[PDB]
Amino acid sequence: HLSLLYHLTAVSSPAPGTPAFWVSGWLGPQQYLSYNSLRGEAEPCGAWVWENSWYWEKETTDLRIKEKLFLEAFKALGGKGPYTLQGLLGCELGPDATSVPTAKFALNGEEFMNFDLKQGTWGGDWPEALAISQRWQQQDKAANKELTFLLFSCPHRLREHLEEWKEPPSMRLKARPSSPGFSVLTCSAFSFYPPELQLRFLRNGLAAGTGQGDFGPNSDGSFHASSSLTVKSGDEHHYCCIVQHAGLAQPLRVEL
């Protein structure tokens, strides 16, 4: 839950007017950083726009580096059809007293490469992974900078970003006519925080299973969720919804 993660994306055939490479920086579930190849500078986000910094130019120097090698990796491929390259870099507060680093890369939607921190180099099994890891390994400093961030800079910043908000959901349980002889119950949870939340249906005090669960963000930093169960008409009042959330003393039962 206390993490520092960077989402990186490069596309070989950007739609005109879109960036070929862009990054979002995350502290827990909130974005603080944003970069893209068209503007070329690390811009703060949210409450981070108000500040004194050395930090935001160190970020712009790094991101320009990543931009050049992410787009350079495409030159190691050689096929035609468009390529999407995604990267996930950062560390977590482990249940330990540790950093648990992450350094995974995906090609056209699935994982194909990683930074091996015991060895200190990029690697993978697909021939595309070997072609790109050696292209990046051919840059001096590049592997050394990647390892420094994951093992030192990143846990350092996570520890100093030490120095818990709660808000329970507004619940609604609404029935709606479905197919012939069926109805749809939908349990909704509006603007809550933190995002961890579970919905369960009960029929006569018995488990009706999960419903079909939806989950989405709000623009203010809160979250929304919903679950829907299809039931038999007339039998709708026999159902209730139980929501669990850190903002509640005890599980909350919602009625129709």
Partner: protein
């Protein structure tokens, strides 16, 4: 590779007529990243919209939040209009006032 969008439409707060609120369109789980999204009041484009940065979940699929400040009337109808390479024709998701 190609994954088709999930489109969820919901108000930030339980909807009541007269009170100001926010309308969200959350497009998630798609691939590749090129996508176009419109918020539709009674049928055509609302221009005072703003959106999140395009990002991606742990399963590598992309997501995007489109939101606007609005005030629900009894009659006005709001929907979301998404177009993606996986869609024959742009999909429209009405805002159901029950969800």
């Amino acid at each position: 590779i190609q994954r088709t969008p999930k489109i969820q439409v919901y108000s930030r707060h339980p909807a009541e007529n007269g009170k100001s609120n926010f309308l969200n369109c959350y497009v998630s789980g798609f691939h590749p990243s090129d996508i176009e999204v419109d918020l539709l009041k009674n049928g055509e484009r609302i221009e005072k919209v703003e959106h999140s940065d395009l990002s991606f979940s742990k399963d590598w699929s992309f997501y995007l939040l489109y939101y606007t400040e609005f005030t629900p009337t009894e009659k006005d109808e709001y929907a979301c209009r998404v177009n993606h390479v996986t869609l024959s024709q742009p999909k429209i998701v009405k805002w159901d006032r029950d969800m």
